[PDB]
């Protein structure tokens, strides 16, 4: 019955800045609002209850205020550990409807990725399949492109990517690309390479190997 909204949807801020996010309710919910934080991969933890009161055992690193339909949550001075998603939730209802969340990442200096390449293991060639793995380690910003080449021939549709969330200490991202082929056509070719383009590289970085 009550729709809760948050603004902005996602933000980037610098370390040491104070970060303000807003929550709004369809109808008047008085001061029955909680503020939760969820760090990537951890469970929610309640930071503020009854709109403005800090929870016991939580540090004095957040303030909150608001009433009626408008509420605000403030990180006093942002730190790399505070990346995550901040939710507001109403409890004027028996629905306890949560807000959509506000994603807080932090802006840092450009960092180029460290590229590694890993050949398919001898154990997996038993199975008849070959997985070549390319790793892009600790880069910023998040955007980066990987392209697989086999005998200098570009590949498409046989690889998959995955990116970790922003690191809690140094605020970088990491990416893993897996190129899967069958052993039969894997042994058909010689040189396997992953070519990486990033904002921090003047030219693409190619890391490669041979089957021997």
């Amino acid at each position: 019955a009550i729709r809760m909204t948050q603004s902005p949807s996602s933000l980037s801020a610098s370390v040491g800045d104070r970060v303000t996010i807003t929550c709004q309710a369809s109808q008047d919910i008085k001061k029955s609002l909680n503020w939760y934080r969820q760090k990537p991969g951890k469970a929610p933890e309640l930071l503020i209850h009854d709109a403005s009161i800090l929870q016991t055992g939580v540090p004095s690193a957040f303030t909150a205020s608001g009433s009626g339909t408008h509420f605000s949550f403030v990180i006093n001075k942002l730190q790399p550990e505070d990346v995550g998603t901040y939710f507001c939730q109403e409890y004027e209802n028996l629905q306890f409807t949560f807000g959509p969340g506000t994603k807080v990442e932090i802006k840092r200096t450009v960092a180029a990725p460290s590229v590694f390449i890993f050949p398919p293991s001898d154990e997996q060639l038993k199975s008849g399949t070959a997985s070549v793995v390319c790793l892009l380690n600790n880069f910023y910003p998040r955007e980066a492109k990987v392209q697989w080449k086999v005998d200098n021939a570009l590949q498409s549709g046989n690889s998959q990517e995955s990116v970790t969330e922003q690191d809690s200490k140094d605020s970088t991202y990491s990416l893993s690309s897996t190129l899967t082929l069958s052993k039969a056509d894997y042994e058909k070719h010689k040189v396997y390479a992953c070519e990486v383009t990033h904002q921090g590289l003047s030219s693409p970085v190619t890391k490669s190997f041979n089957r021997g």
């Binding site: 949807s9 933000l11 980037s12 802006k107 910003p141 998040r142 955007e143």
Partner: peptide, 5 residues
């Protein structure tokens, strides 16, 4: 997938 500054 927010693009930073």
């Amino acid at each position: 997938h927010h693009h930073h500054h």
